[PDB]
Amino acid sequence: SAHLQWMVVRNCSSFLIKRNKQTYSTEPNNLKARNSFRYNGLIHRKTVGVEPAADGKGVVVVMKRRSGQRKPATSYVRTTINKNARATLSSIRHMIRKNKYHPDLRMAAIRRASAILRSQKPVM
Amino acid sequence: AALRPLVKPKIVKKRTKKFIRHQSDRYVKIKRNWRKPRGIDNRVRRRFKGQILMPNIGYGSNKKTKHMLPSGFRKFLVHNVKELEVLLMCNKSYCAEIAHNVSSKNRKAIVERAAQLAIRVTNPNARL
Amino acid sequence: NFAELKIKRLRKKFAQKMLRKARRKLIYEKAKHYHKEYRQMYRTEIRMARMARKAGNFYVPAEPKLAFVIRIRGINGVSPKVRKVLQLLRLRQIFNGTFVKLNKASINMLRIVEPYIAWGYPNLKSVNELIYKRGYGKINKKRIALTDNTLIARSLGKYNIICMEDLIHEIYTVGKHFKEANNFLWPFKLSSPRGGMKKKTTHFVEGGDAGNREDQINRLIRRMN
Amino acid sequence: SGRLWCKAIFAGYKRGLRNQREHTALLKIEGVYARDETEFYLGKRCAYVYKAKNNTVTPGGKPNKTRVIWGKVTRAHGNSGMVRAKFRSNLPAKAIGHRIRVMLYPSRI
Amino acid sequence: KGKPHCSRNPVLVRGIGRYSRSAMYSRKALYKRKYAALATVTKPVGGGTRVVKLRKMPRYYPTEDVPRKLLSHGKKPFSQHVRKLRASITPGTILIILTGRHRGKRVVFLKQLSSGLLLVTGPLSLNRVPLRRTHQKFVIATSTKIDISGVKIPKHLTDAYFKKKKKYEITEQRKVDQKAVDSQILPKIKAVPQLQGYLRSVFALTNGVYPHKLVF
Amino acid sequence: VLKKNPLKNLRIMLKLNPYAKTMRRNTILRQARNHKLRVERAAAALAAKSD
RNA sequence: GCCGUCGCUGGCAGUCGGCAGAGCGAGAAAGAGAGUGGCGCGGACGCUACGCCGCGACGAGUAGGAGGGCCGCUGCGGUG
RNA sequence: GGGCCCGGGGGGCCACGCGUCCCCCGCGAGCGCACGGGGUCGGCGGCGAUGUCGGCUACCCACCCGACCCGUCUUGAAAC
Ligand SMILES: [Mg+2]
Ligand SMILES: [Mg+2]
Ligand SMILES: [Mg+2]
Ligand SMILES: [Mg+2]
Ligand SMILES: [Mg+2]
Ligand SMILES: [Mg+2]
Ligand SMILES: [Mg+2]
Ligand SMILES: [Mg+2]
Ligand SMILES: [Mg+2]
Ligand SMILES: [Mg+2]
Ligand SMILES: [Mg+2]
Ligand SMILES: [Mg+2]
Q1: C193-213 per-residue burial string, b: 16 or more CB within 10 A, e: under 16
Q2: Contact A33 B94 (CB under 8 A)
Q3: Of C129, C86, C144, nearest to C224 (Cα)?
Q4: How many of the other CB atoms lie within 10 Å of CB of B120?
Q5: Is E174 helix (H, G, I), strand (E, B) or coil?
């Protein structure tokens, strides 16, 4: 299930990394990038991920569907938002809040999308 | 315009000097690393007045300002560009640090990616 | 609908508020009755002393039921029986004070530890400084400061001791549940005496501070606290 | 156009017979040798003025070689007009038996 | 609807009323005062009418926010503090300014300002001291007083009048105010014998003179 | 909770004891009335010394 | 004030959000319980539950015992 | 003196309503002030790009106090 494989992943996963009295996870779907149960995305049926796009502009949002859990190719669906700063975060908030799709991670996804926008903004 | 931390508390330290080993001044074979003396008639181990201090648990720093740089950041050793997407989110609290064995052509990419991600590097001019 | 629900919540909040106001009125009137009792007890001893001198006799006052004991000497080099009596009187560090009621057992328990303690018969204002300034209760076996009367009333409400004035009245006018009030009171962690001491080792009679000092303990309670 | 500081000689530190507590300094202000007379200087600001090799900045003027360690007169000491002071940086023992300046402008008059 | 009335009972002790609560009830006469029982703006756009939003959601969020702090109860700003006074510092006295660049000068005190600083002004011919603010602690107060109560101080000058703007040229308003205050001070201090020389001369400590010993 | 001293602090003493409000409201009025009676007795003594 | 130990086997799965109503510090064995007759889509952190947080007391040490080491050296199976 | 200082013919009060019977002689609302569940200022002043600011720790030196060379067997070691 969820906790059953969390008790396996929690110490001996390949994405896990430990140095400088810190612990992280280098997963592509992990948001806030630290080792935690609520933030781990490969375990849960409902998974939100916020990534930069293949191009320089735009932010892609990764949504794990509930049907193909054991099918890794058709598990995740990617959508690109190449929009302005306010309505991009509003679109992600309307994705996570109003669809009843894992509401515990909406604010972390908004923070990560703001970080990717600050990254893709041109440097001073 | 350096990268400021989120909160900057007063980093108080109870002791800044090194706990040097007993009789490290006399002999060259004795290193400065602390080893607890466990003799029967030694002066340091039973806490005589005016002797070398011992590393007790009372000298521990506060948990808010432990492992903290004087800038206000916490160190994290980074080998390549892929380990900066780990620290793009935890930006205002923790900082990055490039390893010694990393070549300059990859240090340039690490510094450029950290400048994009607004992450402070403790050694931004490591090779040049 | 949430029509009757919010109104009933406001009614329950108003009920708790008026219940709290009634308990405050009870605490106020208990403190006023206690002030009247202290006035009566202070004047009746002077009255008994005046009528005996008017008749030509002598008034022997009643022996005071309550004493305050301060462990004035340290822990090093202590007899085991003496150390047992000190830990049964809850005197563990130096300069700790406890209220002890008097009987034939208590007099000999203080007599067996006379050279290590200073015990006397305290005043009402001395009890007031000891309870208000150093008020520490043992709630869930923890030394918690008595900043509110609810902390006293949660532990000793079944013994009709619901406020600081109830506790002071019990300790000064020792009654039934002095054992529960004193066991609620943590041993008073008092400071060093300001100015100095006469002598720690010898008895109060032979030029020191140890032993019994009946009326003179009020000079030393205010000196330490 | 004159002296605006009282003469005080730094005797030593707060010390026992075989221990010293160098964070508290013992100060001997000239002219006052009584506990009833040392109540005036309680709370005044005091400083050991010394000059060094390298130049340091000076507020309200050109940089000079003089340096100070500011402080605060805490409470009296003894019975013969000695007094205490707590400084921010501890005094060197080079200044044993030398002049420091106790001031008047932390006034209570 | 009702006019505001002041406090009935006087300040007997700080935090303690002079009357008890039932006498206060009888004074309030509450026996006969008993009782029983935005963000959206529509704007036409030349389409239809658009509904704009005020205080909309932010476009940028930082990486981490700090939590809110606890509510302290007795921590006032500097404008709302109480402003203390000494018994020696009265309007009319002659002060000794020490810590400023005007060291040891005996300068006449005028009045207490709003922020808490001392408005101190000597004659420009005598002290060479302007309309200057001094701190209360940083001043020796000498008991030498003049009858200053019959003057007309300007009301336009205040703490904001003497606050530093940002070379500093002397404006004409400072000169007019200095002349208007000097014309009120100067005959009252020249009526006192040998006072202008005391104002011109500087204070200085010397050998065998100690402030705990002398009185003033 | 920071233990504020009821002997020093007024409102902590009021929270632990409401009757301390009336105990401290009294012996201000009483002491001022006794001081005014002392001033009246001193004035009567000075009037007796004058007359 | 700070560090560690012990105890309360204390608290936290309640992040229950137009599928909503934001609490269980309060002296008093037990329910902010169901019924039936007379415009604006909005709300910081969290929780490696081997983790996080709050209360109190405690802190010497030879021989000796136990626990924690994201202290250190060498080699192997995985992993970066 | 104690009994709400039993009862009858100038000062303080944690006492505020209406109707019925017997005996004795549970929601009223609004605005501030603050000795109230641990500090704030909605207060400021100076010095600065060719000589100055900060660097607790680490390089050297000066001063005060402390201060006998480690392991060992030993009741006891700085031990002649
Ligand atoms: Mg030995
Ligand atoms: Mg002994
Ligand atoms: Mg003393
Ligand atoms: Mg000089
Ligand atoms: Mg201890
Ligand atoms: Mg130990
Ligand atoms: Mg010496
Ligand atoms: Mg041997
Ligand atoms: Mg042998
Ligand atoms: Mg032998
Ligand atoms: Mg030896
Ligand atoms: Mg020998």
Answers
A1: beeeeeeeeebbeeebbbbbb
A2: no
A3: C129
A4: 22
A5: helix
Strand H neighbours among E 187-216, CB < 7 A: none
**Matching residue, tokens 């969020």:** E61
Of B50, B55, B68, nearest to B12 by C-alpha is: B68
C-alpha A112/C-alpha E122 separation (Å) is 65
Return the DSSP state at E9.
S
- Residue B83's nearest nucleotide, by CA–C1', is G80
Coil vs helix vs strand at D14:
strand
Tokens of residue E41, six digits: 């703006």
- Whether the CB-CB separation of D83 and D24 falls below 8 Å is answered with no
How long, in residues, is chain B? 128
Q: Is B80 on the interface with A (CB under 8 A)?
A: no
Give the separation between CA A23 and CA A43, rounded to whole angstroms: 18
Reduced to 3 states, what is the DSSP secondary structure of residue C46? helix
Angle of the A106-120 helix axis to the A85-96 helix axis, nearest 10: 160
Residue C7 φ/ψ region, left for φ over 0, alpha for ψ in the -120 to 50 degree band, beta for the rest: alpha
Residue corresponding to tokens 């022996």: C63
A32 touches chain B (CB under 8 A): yes
Q: Other CB atoms closer than 10 Å to residue C97's CB: what's the count?
A: 27
Task: Name the burial class of residue E139, with classes exposed (0-12), middle (13-18) and buried (19+) by CB atoms within 10 angstroms of its CB.
Answer: buried
Please answer whether residues C81 and C112 qualify as being in contact, where contact means their C-beta atoms are separated by less than 8 angstroms: yes
Indicate yes or no: CB of E66 within 8 angstroms of CB of B7.
Answer: yes
What are the backbone angles phi and psi of residue D87, rounded to the nearest 5°?
A: -105, 165
Q: Tokens 């505001």, residue?
A: E4
Q: Do B89 and A26 touch (CB under 8 A)?
A: no
The token duo for B3 is 């990268």
Contact residues for E5 (Cβ-Cβ < 8 A; gap 6+) = none
CA distance E11 to E16: 7
D107 and E137 Cβ atoms separated by less than 8 Å: yes
Length of chain F: 51
Cβ neighbours for C172, distance < 8 A, ≥ 6 positions apart: C66, C124, C127
C194 phi/psi in degrees, rounded to 5: -75, 140
Q: Are E112 and E119 within 8 A, CB to CB?
A: yes
CB B81 within 8 A of CB B55: no
Pairing of strands C117-120, C211-212: parallel
Report which residue type is found at B26: R
Nearest residue in E to A108, CA atom: E63
Apex F38 CA angle, F32 and F41, nearest 5: 145
Q: Do chains C and F touch (3 or more CB pairs under 8 A)?
A: yes
Helix (H, G, I), strand (E, B) or coil at C143: strand
Contact call for residues A35 and A16 (beta carbons, < 8 A): yes
> What does this entry list as its resolution, in Å?
3.0
Chain mean position to CA C201: 26
3-class SS of residue E166: coil
Residue C72 tokens read as: 């004035």
| Closest alpha carbon to C1' of H76, residue | B41
Q: Please, which experimental method was used?
A: cryo-EM
